[model samples]
Target chain A: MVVKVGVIGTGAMGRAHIDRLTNVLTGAEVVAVTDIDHEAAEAAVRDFHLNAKVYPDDTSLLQDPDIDAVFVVSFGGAHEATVLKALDTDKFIFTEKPLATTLEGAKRIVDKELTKSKKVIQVGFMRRYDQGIRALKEKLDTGIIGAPLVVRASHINPNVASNYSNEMAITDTLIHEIDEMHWLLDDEYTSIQITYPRQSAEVRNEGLHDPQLATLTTKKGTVIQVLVHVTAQYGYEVKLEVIGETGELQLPNYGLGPILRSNANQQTAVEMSWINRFIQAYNTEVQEFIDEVAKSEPPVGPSAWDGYIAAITAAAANRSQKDQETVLINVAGTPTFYQ
Target chain B: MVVKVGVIGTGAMGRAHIDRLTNVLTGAEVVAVTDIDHEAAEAAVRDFHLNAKVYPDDTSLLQDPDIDAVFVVSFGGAHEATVLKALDTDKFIFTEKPLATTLEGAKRIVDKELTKSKKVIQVGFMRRYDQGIRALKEKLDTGIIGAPLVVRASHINPNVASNYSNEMAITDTLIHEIDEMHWLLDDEYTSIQITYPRQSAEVRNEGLHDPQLATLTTKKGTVIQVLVHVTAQYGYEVKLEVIGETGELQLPNYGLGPILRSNANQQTAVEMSWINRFIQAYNTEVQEFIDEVAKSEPPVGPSAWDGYIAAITAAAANRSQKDQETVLINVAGTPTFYQ
Candidate 1:
């Protein structure tokens, strides 16, 4: 059976998904795409040699019952309505993270989907597919590093728009680590603490401090230290270290290796964003989703439970900032979506 | 005038100091020495080619007015009284770190040295004399990496004796970083937090967790993280990293230029102690002390104040383990002995 797909936004990430479907996915083809700018969508279709028609709006694209799955990369505020439309068509949905901005809306979509009596949604939390993180989890299960006394993970972005708000930094940026660490460590987080350092007077963070730290601890006695550096002078840095009773295991830093120049300027490539850093994982995630969809099996990236936890944690942290208190995350009992 | 030195102990460190003086110091002579065991002291005097007479006790050695300086490497518990004796003789003194066990004792020694008309006491914090640390300090001062925002340092010893107590493990073993980081960061620590993980059942410090972590925040808002692994499974590991605004500067791991062997079981020498890890610093420290004593200049290792602050920090951290609180460190004004 042919695995036909449609992409809803022709932006940077939207085009990336089209490329994955056209060039990387073994059994899939992007049959249709929609964008606010018709010419840009047509250009992407031509660049990837995608056998897809361009539509001016998402309603026409999702109304096509021929498309088997929808890759929703539209603007954040519009994803919920698009998702509801895709669910009415019964097309499998691969949505970008923060499935919806509000938990109430996300829960509504999830409830409506469950009433349809199927599991067809896979949220994009690609760190779950990252090879190094997978290796760490494997080592932990094998008792290679003992019972993993602590796990430290971080997500760092090199630069942000001058008008970037702190709330987006938390939900869109740090939510990656929060979601992945909970799944990787197989433990529930007990608390979240956010701290901000004194800002550099020279570099104004548009009105806020550029760099911050977020600490998370688990009920099983694992401590996670994360540095959410939004305005680092140098390039972006990401690191993961697992400390156990016997020894430590770490993921290698991504770079073109260390370079030594004559002027004592040693530099390495900063993976600009998620795609450059984890291209392999992104490809694997989509391929797996297509494979599972074709075989009538469940999706592979992140289950509904993973998406629910991410939304809950982000909502709690956001509220904690407003309330000026440490947030205690209360996730519902483990959902059978993963099972 | 040449500086005449006396070594008051013939232990491992004592012998090491004598060897350094004989081979490295240009204007110094080890003219007298003593140990509880006469043979060990005489053998060191002969092997190091010192023009020294062996004494049965430190009392007889300290009474020698011909001696211009003293290096105390005797039992750490007895350092205060011996240093006081040398102070009365008006001789310059260089005593190993952890100047005394208790904070009160260290304070008293600092007070007595300040009361004297002239002050000459250099606490043996060899890391201050280390070339790598000196290079890092120079880079920091030049703003090579901008103002340093964080420092991560660890001192992991391969083994600790069964007789070692909790306080001794922290003071005698972990004090190296305390003294060095104080000077490296150039501020008094404002607070300390300690955490101890579960211990490996096999180690000599069986009942005690051989490794512990000490987190320190300085008055100027720079954070320092130190991990002390007293009974590591492998050989000694020493690491230091300074994270600054512009970039990071790190002390490279000791590379004795690789080892190749075809043995049945591959083998290489691992640094087992400070003498192995920082032998160059140890030699330079003694050489500088001799030069400073002859020139009537203040000796430089760490000052008496450095020792006092380290003791206070260690005692407070140890108390935190029992009290379950973030200990507040309050160090008073620097002494004239340090000036």
Candidate 2:
């Protein structure tokens, strides 16, 4: 059985997912699409050569009875409303991160999903689906390395769009880590300490902080430090290292291509695009989401609770950044439903 | 012209330095030696075939008119008294780590040195003299990477002695990083958070916490995290990585020996001893100290102030570990006299 999917928003990520759904995966077909910029939606349908209809707005496409699963990939501000409305329907939902633009709005989505009690929402936290991450997680789970004592993770980008703001550094870039680490460590972040290091001269945006250092501690006392650098100006580099009691494991740098030697210099090329590095992970994520929907399984990716928790963690990090001090993450225990 | 040096203590590190001074380095001669166990001092003199006299105590060695320089390599608890006595003379002093056993003792050394108004004391924080660490520090000094955003360091050991206690995790293991980060970032540590992770099952020390994760923030807002695992059971490993605004620098793994393949498995040998790794750095550290002394230079290495700062940092970490929260490092600014 194939799930008939509707994709809302036809921006870079949305169009990329559309290609994955249309060309890369079985069990899913892109039957409808929507964008506030209706032409982009139409462009996606034509570009991917899909037998799909383009709607003028999210509501129009989300209301389509033929769409069995919908990917809410619209602008950040529109998510709370669109996701809340989508929850009113029977279709499975894969909303892009931030469940809402703010933590309070994310709480509403979690609350709305809980009222129905059957989880149909899968937030797009794709890193959890990465093969390398899963492999690393398995090693950590076996306790061969003993319990993880600390984690050092770097999410470094060459640069962000001119439109990217300081808040986006946390909301967009660091949000993935918030969820990825949640799954990796299996612990709740109890506090966050934010430090803004020297702003890169390469940062063109005046209001943006290029690199943010976030130190978060879990309830189990594992210190997770993340360097979120949007203006690394080098390349797209992501690294994670878990220092366990008996051993240490570093995430293997995969897919950067082979090391080349020329002119007496040995070098490996750095990836410029984050998508290139995680394209397979994205494919895997969407494929899994589609499989669950097509197989009539309850949604089983990053859930609304995970989304809410990430939002809450991001808010704590934001608070730490705002006050320029360590802030306690005052989040409740995971709900029994999410567990 | 050689400096006639007196060595206080003939412990493992003391014997190692004695070998360096007598064989690997120039411009120094060990003319005197002392230890609480006078037999160990006499044994070191005989083992190295030294033309050195064994003294009953550090004071006897330090008071020798023929001893132009002194290495206070005694037990940690004796550093304050021996170094203080050495500071009262015209001899150059190279004290092995922990300027003192306690923070108050470290403070006393600082005060005693300040009264002399001469930078005659060089504390043994030898990672500074390491080739790879020096190379990494040079890269950070250059604005090529912009400013360093964060640093991740690990000092992992296979195991510790049965006498090792929880505080020694900070005082002995994490102390290297406290001074190394201070010099690398060239900033005062303002605060510290200490987390003791799950103890390794392999740990035999009853009073010891095997692995400690320390999160320290510098005055420059640089976040430096260190993992000190004494019961790694996986051989010795040390790593330092700096995340800059535009780039990242990692201290290359220098001396783990060659990669070998056998039995359908490829592996690089993990070093079993840190001494094997930094023996050359120890050579350089002692060679430089001797050169400065022989050349009539007052002192040129980590100062009593640096040692005091590390002690203060470690104390903050201890408080943080005890209270299970972040603790502020309250230290005075570097005295201009030393600067």
Candidate 3:
């Protein structure tokens, strides 16, 4: 069974989704797409030779009865309303993270989704499906590192946004890590501590308030030290380390293997972006979401509860930044959506 | 002309020194002997077939004009008095670390040596002489790590003492790394922050209250994260990672070569003690010091200044433990004795 998909708010991410669906994902089709700039979406349709009909607005496209699922590729601030709408339509929905600008907004979306019987929402936490992370998790489960003492994960972005704020560092960037840790470690967070360091003014000009460190304590009493330096002069980098009693299992930097040359230096290229870093994982995430749609069940990325936990942790981190004390995150009981 | 040497204290380290000098070093002869437990020294003299006369007391041994150098292999607490006595006899000396119990005692000994107008002391800071550490230092010297934004070094002992205190964790165990970093990075440490984590009661019973994290910043403003866990639950493990602008250079783990066995579990033994871990480096350091002694020059295992710096840092770390503050180490100008 083929799952017909429509992507709303076509941008770089939208084009990326189209490429993945058309080239990599079998039994899935980009049946519809729309952009705020209609010309851009139309150009994507022609370029990728997508069979989907292009639309002008997201709502009309999302409301289309023929579309089996909606991929919300819109910008950061608009995820809440669009995601809530898709949840109400009961279409299997995949949205880029942040779910909403505030925890209350994210909570409302999650609360509304729980009102429906089935779990149709899959927020983008593609790292959960990453092969290396899965391997590390398997090793941990097999007692390679004994009882997990710490879980360290970081997302480092090279390209800077023109309007990146301090909040986005946690919300737009670190939320993936926040949700994934809870899912990966199979533990709930007990408290959070955050510390910000001064960075090069160049990074500040590029709209980041320097990279920061977020130390988290899990309900199982493990301590995780995360270094999230989005503006570290190097190229995009991602590192995940789980330090335990016996040893450490970590995800190393990814690349196309070492490129040796006659030059004086031995070097390898840093991954250019998150997509290049986790391209395979991202495809698997989308394919699994499509697979769930075919089975007539819920999607399997991060659940709405995972999104709520992310927002809760982010809000706690924000309070930690302001109050200079570890802030307790209050995430309510497990939602039936995940069940 | 062989430098006639007297073995002063016949303990484990003293026996190690005699073994290395007899089998590995050629320039020195063990020409005299003295120990409170004279039987051990007498046994060493007979076993190594040294042409040395055993003396009941150190006083009678020092009176012999035949001994040109003295190896003070006494306990760390006894190092100061023995070393000062050797200096009074105008004999060059090599001693293991903890030059003395306190800074004032070390300074007084150093002052007396300065009054003598000779370079007469070498302390055992062996990592500076390790092949891996030397390779790292050469890379740093060539600016391979590009002015080094951060450095991570560790001295993870497999097992620790039964009653190791907070002071001894940084002092006796981590002091080698502190001395090596000073020499390797060629920068004074501006500040230090230490954190203690709970360890197994069995380990703590062995006097190993493993203080886990030592965060340091160099005078050049480079951040260094050091983990010197004395109870790693494996064998002695050492790691040095330099993070720079261009790239990172990390020393890979030394392993017992892989084993292929048909069993439910295959395990390899990690080096459980310092002797097993850096035996080659220890031999090499002794050879180099012997060569320097033959050339009638100052010895090079670790200079007296290295001992001074480490002692001062250890003292500051002790004070940091007592006061619960990030300790600032103040090392005065190089004493004229080392010059």
* DockQ metric for all predictions: 0.28, 0.48, 0.22
Spell out the clash pairs found in candidate 3: A31-A52, B161-B206, B161-B207, B162-B205, B162-B206, B162-B207, B163-B206, B163-B207, B164-B207, B164-B208
Q: Candidate 1, A104: how far from true, in Å?
A: 5.6
**By DockQ: ranked, best first:** 2, 1, 3
True-vs-predicted CA distance for residue B12, candidate 3, Å: 1.6
- Model 3 C-alpha RMSD vs. true structure (Å) is 3.8
Worst 10 residues of 3 chain B by lDDT: B197-206
Q: Write the per-residue lDDT of candidate 3 for residues A1-339, one digit (tens) a residue.
A: 999999987887888888999988888899999888989999889989988888878888888999999998887778888887787686889887778868898889877987887888888888788898898888889976667765556566664666777778788887878877887789888888776543433365543555566777777766666666665556788788776666767786688867877569677788767767878888998888999999998876787777887899988887787754779865788855576
* Cα-based lDDT at residue B59, candidate 3: 76
Worst 10 residues of 1 chain A by lDDT: A196-205
- Give the DockQ (C-alpha) for candidate 1: 0.28
Task: Summarize candidate 1's per-residue lDDT along A1-339 as a digit string, tens digits.
Answer: 769989998887898888878876699889899988888889889999877888788889888888889899976656778887887877899988767766776777777777666788898888888887798778777866565555555555656665566676667677788788888888888777665543443355555544555667677767666666666566666788776656667887786656667576666666677667778888989889999889867686686567767777777766665643568876778656456
Top candidate when judged by DockQ against the true structure: 2
Inter-residue clash pairs, candidate 1 = none
* Candidate 1 regions with alpha-carbon error over 4 angstroms: A31-61, A74-89, A99-113, A139-141, A197-210, A256-270, A311-332, B35-49, B56-59, B198-207, B259-272, B333-339
For A1-339, candidate 2 gives per-residue lDDT tens digits of: 989999988888899999888888887889999888988988999999999988878778877899999998877667889999998898899998878768998999988888875778988888988888889999899988888877888888898887787878887889989888878998888888887765667788879876788878888878787888888888997899888877788898766578889998788888898677889888988888888998767778888888888889888887787876878886777787787
